[PDB]
Structure 1
Amino acid sequence: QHILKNPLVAQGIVDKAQIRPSDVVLEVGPGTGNLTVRILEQAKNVVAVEMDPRMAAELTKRVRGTPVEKKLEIMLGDFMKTELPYFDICISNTPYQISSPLVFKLINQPRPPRVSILMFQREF
């Protein structure tokens, strides 16, 4: 698990997602919650999908006691095996290896997300 040492980059991904205040955002691979906290301030709901129970516990702790805590839902486990709710937009920061199955899961999701902004490898 790696972290984005660039704090002036997450902002550009969030911009390209073109958030509406009514949006439900699916965040897959929230990590330490660097993007999550920013997404919560701009969207109606953030459904964060995380495999690691340690990261999920830390993510709950990071938003704890903040005014936007109640707009976070954390779905724990493998996103591939997750029945995904409705979401308007998606942001991804999950491992590159999943990226391949994950794209076709997003495409085949019943009602497809209007837009998605995903971090992959240079070749993929």
Structure 2
Amino acid sequence: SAEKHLSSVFKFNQHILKNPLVAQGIVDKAQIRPSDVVLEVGPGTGNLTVRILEQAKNVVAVEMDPRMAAELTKRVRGTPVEKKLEIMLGDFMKTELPYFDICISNTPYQISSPLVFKLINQPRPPRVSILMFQREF
């Protein structure tokens, strides 16, 4: 009955960065501290998320596509960072976001602008927030 529920929530029916160096720098610009925690959005391959994991005690990632979470689970399978990592499946606008000190996110531009205002209005907001985003807006 588990798989049928997984079908019920999500039908199971994106642009990817080639340059890790810029993504590496975005972690460097975030300047997360070990005593601090991170919430992640739109992990995808999550090579950015791994760089968070080595630095942050606790990493909570939310992936929109169930399949992208799976390939993440496979890649991080059998690693110490996996246990600290938390993967969240599905749209996090509805769910009350757990507290996180800093934001790193490859958020889709379609849903981005509501998420910022939720992030701004999220009680006890982060001191620092970094989001991957379109230029014009």
- Structure 1 vs Structure 2 CA RMSD: 1.0
C-alpha displacement of 1:36: 1.1
Structure 2 unaligned residues grouped into runs of 5+: 1-13
CA distance in 2, matches of 1:103, 1:94: 10
C-alpha displacement of 1:43: 0.4
Answer 1 or 2: which has greater helix percent: 2
| Identity over aligned pairs, percent | 100
- Structure with higher Rg: it is 2
C-alpha displacement of 1:101: 0.5
C-alpha displacement of 1:82: 2.1
C-alpha displacement of 1:48: 0.1
Asked if the contact 1:32–1:55 (Cα under 8 Å) also holds between the matched residues in 2, the reply is: yes
Between the two proteins, the alignment pairs up a number of residues equal to 124
**1:84 to 2:97 alignment:** yes
CA distance in 1, matches of 2:55, 2:44: 19
CA distance in 2, matches of 1:113, 1:79: 17
C-alpha displacement of 1:83: 1.2
Instruction: Write out per-residue CA displacement over residues 2-29 of structure 1, whole angstroms, 9 at most, x where no aligned residue.
Output: 1110111111110111111122111110
Secondary structure of the residue aligned to 1:81 is coil
Report 1 or 2 for greater relative contact order, CA contacts < 8 Å, sequence distance ≥ 6. Answer: 1
Secondary structure of the residue aligned to 1:8 is helix
CA distance in 1, matches of 2:15, 2:62: 17
C-alpha displacement of 1:114: 1.4
CA distance in 2, matches of 1:68, 1:120: 27
CA distance in 1, matches of 2:36, 2:86: 14
Secondary structure of the residue aligned to 2:80 is coil
Secondary structure of the residue aligned to 2:21 is coil
CA distance in 2, matches of 1:82, 1:9: 30
C-alpha displacement of 1:81: 1.5
C-alpha displacement of 1:37: 1.2
Instruction: Write out per-residue CA displacement over residues 32-80 of structure 1, whole angstroms, 9 at most, x where no aligned residue.
Output: 1111111110100110011111011111111111121111001111121
